[PDB]
Design a protein around this ligand. Structure first.
Ligand SMILES: NC(=O)c1ccc[n+]([C@@H]2O[C@H](COP(=O)([O-])OP(=O)(O)OC[C@H]3O[C@@H](n4cnc5c(N)ncnc54)[C@H](OP(=O)(O)O)[C@@H]3O)[C@@H](O)[C@H]2O)c1
Ligand SMILES: Nc1nc(=O)c2c([nH]1)NCC(CNc1ccc(C(=O)N[C@@H](CCC(=O)O)C(=O)O)cc1)=N2
Length: 155
């Protein structure tokens, strides 16, 4: 199955220091393939350890430490037969994979940020919330945040 995982500021914009959210990201992606667009790959700056890193780009790859693919269908195929594929962004990539996804792992962060790019719109009635957990800010985490998992119920 295909899952998307994202951190969402106010208004679902995709500034804080949230080690707890990065731990959540790692726990939910470790030992799974991760699919990302080239801009997200460049931003991360190094492969995510313990995961197969699959990078979408229209152009030939430029780093032998990760696997490069040129289309959504190739990216999925390159994951093989695994129980769960994690799509880690960015916007362009989330838009393409959302219709194919069965799960969303979202962190709703209580912060407004400088950006006009939003997590894709999706029908609220297509999804069921199956987990949520709110945390206030503390000495290590600059803002309050809420983890959520949603499972798809309809197309
Ligand atoms: N969207 C906005 O409103 C906005 C506003 C300001 C700045 N930005 C900038 O946009 C960038 C992030 O955009 P993002 O989050 O959407 O990027 P992303 O998903 O991380 O990466 C997009 C890149 O992934 C590749 N890709 C995606 N789908 C593909 C497909 N089906 N086949 C082949 N390649 C595919 C392309 O790489 P190739 O280019 O190598 O083909 C594409 O340019 C940042 O640099 C940010 O500063 C965006
Ligand atoms: N919940 C969530 N939070 C994010 O920050 C996030 C997300 N989802 N989905 C995609 C994404 C894209 N950017 C990034 C940037 C850095 C790491 C990263 O460094 N992860 C480490 C965490 C451990 C650490 O660095 O202290 C990892 O091994 O996963 C991951 C994704 N970021």
């Amino acid at each position: 199955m295909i899952s998307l995982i994202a951190a969402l500021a106010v208004d679902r914009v995709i500034p804080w220091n949230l080690p707890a959210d990065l731990a959540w990201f790692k726990r939910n992606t470790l030992n799974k393939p991760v699919i990302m667009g080239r801009h997200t790959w460049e931003s991360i700056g190094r492969p995510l350890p313990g995961r197969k890193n699959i990078i979408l780009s229209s152009q030939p790859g430029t780093d032998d430490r990760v696997t490069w693919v040129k289309s959504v269908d190739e990216a999925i195929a390159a994951c093989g037969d695994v129980p769960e594929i994690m799509v880690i962004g960015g916007g362009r990539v989330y838009e393409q994979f959302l219709p194919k996804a069965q799960k969303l792992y979202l962190t709703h962060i209580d912060a407004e940020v400088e950006g006009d790019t939003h997590f894709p719109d999706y029908e609220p009635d297509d999804w069921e919330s199956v987990f949520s957990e709110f945390h206030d800010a503390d000495a290590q985490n600059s803002h309050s945040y809420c983890f959520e998992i949603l499972e798809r119920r309809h197309h």
